[PDB]
Amino acid sequence: KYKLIMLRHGEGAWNKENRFCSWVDQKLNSEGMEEARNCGKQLKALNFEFDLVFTSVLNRSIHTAWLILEELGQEWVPVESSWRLNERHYGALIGLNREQMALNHGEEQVRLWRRSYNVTPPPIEESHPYYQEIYNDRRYKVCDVPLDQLPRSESLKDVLERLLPYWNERIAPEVLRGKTILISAHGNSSRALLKHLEGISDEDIINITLPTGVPILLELDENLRAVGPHQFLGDQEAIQAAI
Amino acid sequence: SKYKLIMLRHGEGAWNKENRFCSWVDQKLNSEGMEEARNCGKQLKALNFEFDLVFTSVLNRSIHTAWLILEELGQEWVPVESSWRLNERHYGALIGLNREQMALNHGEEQVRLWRRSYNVTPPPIEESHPYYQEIYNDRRYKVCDVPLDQLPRSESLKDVLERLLPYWNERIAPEVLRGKTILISAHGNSSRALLKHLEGISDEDIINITLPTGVPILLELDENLRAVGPHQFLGDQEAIQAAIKKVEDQGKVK
């Protein structure tokens, strides 16, 4: 077998204003940082000793890895970041209040826009309050594919399609070669990698519910295909939230 | 063809306040060292620096200094790479001992030579030392470009140069050649050793370079990667000199 840990960061202001962060580089809050600080205390109690850490290019994912590495005393562990682990691009829904988008278009459409393997939201356009903050940022000018070729909106399926090469090419070699890897990612990019490993269907995946601030162990074979459900490590007094 | 590079020294930790030798002991910043980091970041942002790559040692005080600066800059996504080759000088058996006491029992001349000289090697560390095992049993020093038993047990400034220059030649300098803007988060002696090589400083003159903590060091190089003039400090003139008299006074008596 092989082992692998993924997780997702905690809370920010927009995660409390009930808004769509998505590609907006919004930061963690007191509880967001403390959550990851506790998550590292947990992996410490677990005697966890990583070799490589993989993140998105959004800071809430990076501070999360960093705060974790400090609790472990593992700050020298190599870190790699990639747009291909970014949160899903929610197009024009970025930054708007979701409990009032449900007031315009109705719950059924907003629910579908987030619990759907196949549905692409409206594309963010140059008029959007945050179009510039995303596409002009220097971190997207040095990417592996040109600025114009980055998506302006994504389905959950879109996330996996851009993710999977990064897994095949950057990650999978390393998890092959023994390295205990941590993946500090987001709600959808975590959901998509679990699908491709647990072979989840285009219909069971919209059901999958991953907590935040919680390690997610996952065992593999030499095929690198899953061997069981994803399990959650730590003080299993951790069955909270999930709306 | 006209390159710029930023190099700097981390800030205060507990043993710094205690006036001890840290060397390869993985001491953390205290919260004032953390503010030095943040102040570097602010100054770097006020010059609108955009880094493409950051290099550090594997001592966490140099890594945290770097992470703090990236956050000030909004550049947390900029790749970071770390290497024992940028480590502080290994101070042998003086690791953990107070500096002003060393001057009392050996003279300020002997202490100055121990700290700032080119080819005076410290008394090596022995298995008896309270921090021996925690150093050479640390996982970070395992998967390397050098066997565990071959890691030094003390180091002259010259020994530092001989282990740092290969990492410059093969890892930092090519990225400078590509046009990337580089930040180097290291320590007093590893930065002096690379300044000695880049500036061609004599064996006899490197004794007189003291680097202030928490202060950006701007370096300009030509198309052969040699300095164009002497390294320069960013920040207020008088305050840097006052901070420099500070560092050398650590080895002088009442």
* A116 shares contact with chain B (CB less than 8 Å): no
Tokens 């202060």, residue? Answer: B215
Q: Check the annotation: does A40 bind a ligand.
A: no
Say yes or no for a CB contact (<8 Å) between A142 and B52: yes
* B81 shares contact with chain A (CB less than 8 Å): yes
CA distances, A161 to each of A118, A165, A167 (Å): 12, 8, 10
Tokens 């278009």, residue? Answer: A105
A180 CA: distance to closest CA in chain B (Å): 13
| Total residues belonging to chain B | 254
B149 — phi, psi (to 5°)?
-65, -20
Q: Which sign, positive or negative, has the C-alpha torsion A26, A32, A38, A43? A: negative
**Radius of gyration of chain B from Cα atoms?**
17
Cross-strand partners of B217: B7, B233
Q: Which residues of chain B from 139 to 158 reach within 8 Å of chain A, CB to CB? A: 139-140
Q: At a CB cut-off of 8 Å and minimum separation 6, what does A150 contact?
A: A83, A135, A140, A143
CB A25 within 8 A of CB A59: yes
Domain with B2 in it: 1-254
Cβ atoms within 10 Å of B74's Cβ, excluding its own: 17
CA distances, A42 to each of A49, A186, A235, B62 (Å): 12, 19, 8, 25
Largest Cα–Cα distance in chain B? 51
Q: How many domains are contained in chain B?
A: 1
Q: Select from B65, B71, B53, B72 the least CA-distant residue to B5.
A: B53
Q: How is chain A classified by DSSP, letter by letter?
A: -EEEEEEE----STTTTTB--TTS-PPP-HHHHHHHHHHHHHHHHTT---SEEEE-SSHHHHHHHHHHHHHHT-TTS-EEE-GGGSPP--GGGTTSBHHHHHHHH-HHHHHHHHS-SS---PPP-TTSTTHHHHHTSGGGTSSSS-GGGS-SS--HHHHHHHHHHHIIIIIHHHHHTT--EEEEE-HHHHHHHHHHHHT--TTTGGG----SS--EEEEE-TT--BSS--EE-S-S-------
Alpha-carbon distance of B151 to B153, in angstroms, equals: 7
Task: From the candidates B36, B64, B88, B231, give the one annotated as an active-site residue.
Answer: B88
Amino acid of residue B100:
E
As a three-state string, the secondary structure of A202-216 is CCCHHHCCCCCCCCE
Alpha-carbon distance of B86 to B84, in angstroms, equals: 5
Q: Check the annotation: does A114 bind a ligand.
A: yes
Q: How was this structure determined?
A: X-ray
The three-class DSSP label of residue B40 is helix
Instruction: List, in sequence order, every beta strand (DSSP E) within B180-216.
Output: 182-186
* B100 shares contact with chain A (CB less than 8 Å): no
Query: Tokens standing for A129?
Result: 């309050």
Q: Which of A75, A79, A136 to mutate to test the interface with B (most CBs of B within 10 A)?
A: A75
Say yes or no for a CB contact (<8 Å) between B64 and A79: no
